[PDB]
Design a protein that fits this description.
Elements: H1 3-9, H2 15-21, H3 24-32, H4 38-44, H5 53-68, E1 71-81, H6 106-117, E2 123-128, H7 137-147, E3 153-157, H8 163-172, E4 176-178, H9 186-192, H10 201-205, H11 207-213, E5 218-221, H12 230-247, E6 252-255, H13 275-288, E7 293-296, H14 302-308, E8 315-317, H15 344-353, E9 357-359
Parallel strand pairs: 1-2, 1-8, 1-9, 2-3, 3-4, 4-5, 5-6, 6-7, 7-8
Bound molecules: 5'-deoxyadenosine, tyrosine (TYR), methionine (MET), iron/sulfur cluster (SF4), bromide ion (BR) (5 copies) and potassium ion.
Residues 90-91, 157, 180, 182, 224, 258, 260-261, 263, 299, 335-336 line the site of 5'-deoxyadenosine (5AD).
Length: 366
Amino acid sequence: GTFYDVIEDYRHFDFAAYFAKVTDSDVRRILRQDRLSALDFLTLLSPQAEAYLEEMAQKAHRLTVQHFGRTMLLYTPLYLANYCVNQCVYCGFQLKNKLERKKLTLAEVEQEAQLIAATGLKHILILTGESRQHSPVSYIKDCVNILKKYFSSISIEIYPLTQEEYAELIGAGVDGLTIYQEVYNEEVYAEMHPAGPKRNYRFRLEAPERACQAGMRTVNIGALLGLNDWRQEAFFTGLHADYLQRRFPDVEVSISPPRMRPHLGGFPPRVVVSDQNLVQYVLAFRLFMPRSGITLSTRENGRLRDAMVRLGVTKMSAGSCTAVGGRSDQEAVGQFQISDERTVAEVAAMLYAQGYQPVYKDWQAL
Ligand SMILES: C[C@H]1O[C@@H](n2cnc3c(N)ncnc32)[C@H](O)[C@@H]1O
Ligand SMILES: N[C@@H](Cc1ccc(O)cc1)C(=O)O
Ligand code: MET
Ligand code: SF4
Ligand SMILES: [Br-]
Ligand SMILES: [Br-]
Ligand SMILES: [Br-]
Ligand SMILES: [Br-]
Ligand SMILES: [Br-]
Ligand SMILES: [K+]
């Protein structure tokens, strides 16, 4: 009884045959409905629905304001360590790449925490590579103990854990989990993850459930856009979010639509995803799950992020750095290349000028 059962059930679902049946009347009908099914969400991801993106954006904006107000939660990532045993083809930290492997000392964690907290942020997301030798759970726990002096919400985006390990970290102060399945098609997942513990598709797929079972307050998921058939991968992300929300009615479920960016190693995206595709996904997902967060990172350029402020995004990073210690070492190599280099203050000033209140604690979004 896990999401894997749903993946198994859709193994023979014929996406092309479904899209072939969609008509404009279907899209107009869905825009009149209060509740959407998962296949109504698939219809809003169809080529035919590209003719209705304005109507979708009008309603998506209304729904977002209804549930979140004219607010935007700000946060930033903190990469603690970049040791990794996995060979993910698309990642700057994959094992076969040559870079300075680094783990922050606890005093470096504290100093970077102070630097970030000095901008006003209260939500932090901490990341590591998969290395139980260099960045074990006990080290992550020690970092959480320091960070809780500065941040009221600490989320983890680390290697997948057991339920008991999630419970341990929640007991130390972790509030939220972000974990991207990367690709929901099992065959393509095996192709993208040729070596390491991350080759275990099902263990990763079930990680959000294990964390929710352990009591995680918030969970943020997402496919990595660029690895596989984008409409199917967007569909499965939404299907997964809906599954989690139904299995755990009191967890706050969110999605991210991260697009592949340049990175050390140079693997090019297996599939191309346009700006309009990204917008269609965000709009369709907002209409499918009106109360779910949508997180937009600095992978997107500033002009597109500015345009998406009113289109369903509820959480934005700012002042990001994808390299371990890169906030004080401009030559440090990041996991991938960011696009929007604006600081926290610059993103907050942009939001105020759009009539949106930047907020620093998630409970202020209503
Ligand atoms: C932390 C998250 O970053 C994403 N990730 C890994 N490599 C890249 C890349 N080249 N570009 C953009 N995002 C990436 C993965 O989805 C990973 O889970
Ligand atoms: N790549 C991670 C951490 C991150 C968050 C926001 C950024 O702007 C950059 C990196 C994520 O998207 O969850
Ligand atoms: C830094 S990538 C995100 C955390 C972990 N290495 C993963 O791939 O799940
Ligand atoms: S995505 Fe996470 S597991 Fe894969 S190489 Fe990068 S850091 Fe390692
Ligand atoms: Br029609
Ligand atoms: Br490991
Ligand atoms: Br919802
Ligand atoms: Br970089
Ligand atoms: Br900043
Ligand atoms: K030190």
